[PDB]
């Protein structure tokens, strides 16, 4: 069943783990002038569920320069009271000989004509380590997945 | 008290931007602890400490936030007892007792793994009735029986039984057969899995045969390892 | 019960216990309580395809014998398996026909455990009687025997 912290929320994604033994439901609200995201993390073997945050994020596999194994990154973007920030991070223990990936943050810019605007979708190219971000207005930005350095931003919609 | 391993280096300073973690596990009166020492070998203060585990075979999690309240100054070294329980999400790891960890502070997130010694998962109520022991050993498929060798042991059966008792491995019965001591023993994991054991102690033989029956025989290898460590320490 | 493979023989090794021989294993079943058939060992390949014909154990049920014969090149060749249950090790036939006895040798207080086995081989048919495992403490060992059949 849908956990009440979600009630009235824009459902925007549904995700499981590989075993389907955990389930994630997400949705966002326009709560008091910000895009607040709600998540439901359901345990299927425990039969217990909890509430959590947010909105445009995806996971990659990236081989860092001198390692043999592909670090599992979790890249997510939000606009908060501090303004819009993208985070890339390792998730879980590095495969054994791997030198850990430094966590990253960068700010995502929203113009003054971008008055409300916030993140909405993310996709990463594995072919070219790049983070594609789409906002609510129809703005795009690409960031370098390893070093979150901005590489372009423009309106396409 | 049961066997506790010496602390070992889990995260070296040079891998973790000057953070050094050493650790062991303990069981104190029905309570599991991850016992660590954190040392700041960096030139910055360290703050904002936090920890999590990946999903694991015995559903092991911290039961509270990590109790580091004050900045860990350069050169400083603190002893941290983190309480654990087994209520957390289960995913079967390889090895079965491996635990993946992430530790954060104000500089970065770091990761490491360590191996949980299974005797901290041996529960207080792990003594089987003799009746039930015989019935359960007989109910468990004989293909599940696994044999192991405790090499170079010279403890008497009494001393084996008292040391194992202190680790919640209970002796149910003892059989003298022609100078051989047979010890029949039960233990129970935090997940409710029972393990039954026959130790065989023979005159002249520096090696004891440990025979283990379990419904989940994959675990038996790890019981033997800590059984061996308890006898040898 | 309902075994998951047909059992290609059985014999009541004791006052309460049922040996089941499947195509690839042997199982004891007790009669007693809710307990179900227990695998004591798998079938050793020298038996494969054989007319099984007997199964036998020792009084201790600490050795198990499976037997069974073939019509190999015009002869009724008997195979046997001799499983050790405490050792967990199993030989093809070193004694095919064989049984164990307790015997009190003339000036001893204690009954020596004899293992009698009879084979035909390249040297022809030989029965062997032997002591099995250490004599009881004051006992004069039994001399190993061999005779041709």
Numbering used by the authors:
A (entry chain Y): 143 to 299
B (entry chain B): 705 to 937
C (entry chain Z): 102 to 250
The authors write:
Here, we analysed the cryo‐EM structure of clathrin cages assembled in the presence of β2 hinge‐appendage (β2HA). In the case of class 15, these densities were in a different location to that shown by our global analysis, on alternate terminal domains within a polyhedral face. We also found that separating the hubs according to whether the β2HA density linked terminal domains emerging from two pentagonal faces or from one pentagonal face and one hexagonal face resulted in improved map definition. These two classes were refined separately to global resolutions of ∼10 Å (10.5 Å for P‐P hubs and 10.1 Å for H‐P hubs, Fig EV4B and C), consistent with the reduced number of particles in each subset. As a control, we performed a similar analysis with the α‐appendage domain which does not bind clathrin. These results predict that residue Tyr 815 on the β2‐appendage makes the largest contribution (14 kJ mol−1) with Asp 812, Gln 804 and Lys 759 contributing at or above a 5 kJ mol−1 threshold at that interface. Interestingly, in our model Lys 140, Lys 189 and Asp 187 form salt bridge contacts with Glu 847, Glu 849 and Arg 904, respectively.
Clathrin‐coated pits are formed by the recognition of membrane and cargo by the AP2 complex and the subsequent recruitment of clathrin triskelia. Clathrin cannot recognize membrane or cargo itself and so an adaptor protein binds the membrane, selects the cargo, and associates with clathrin leading to pit formation. The appendage is divided into platform and sandwich subdomain, each with a tyrosine residue previously identified to be important for clathrin binding.
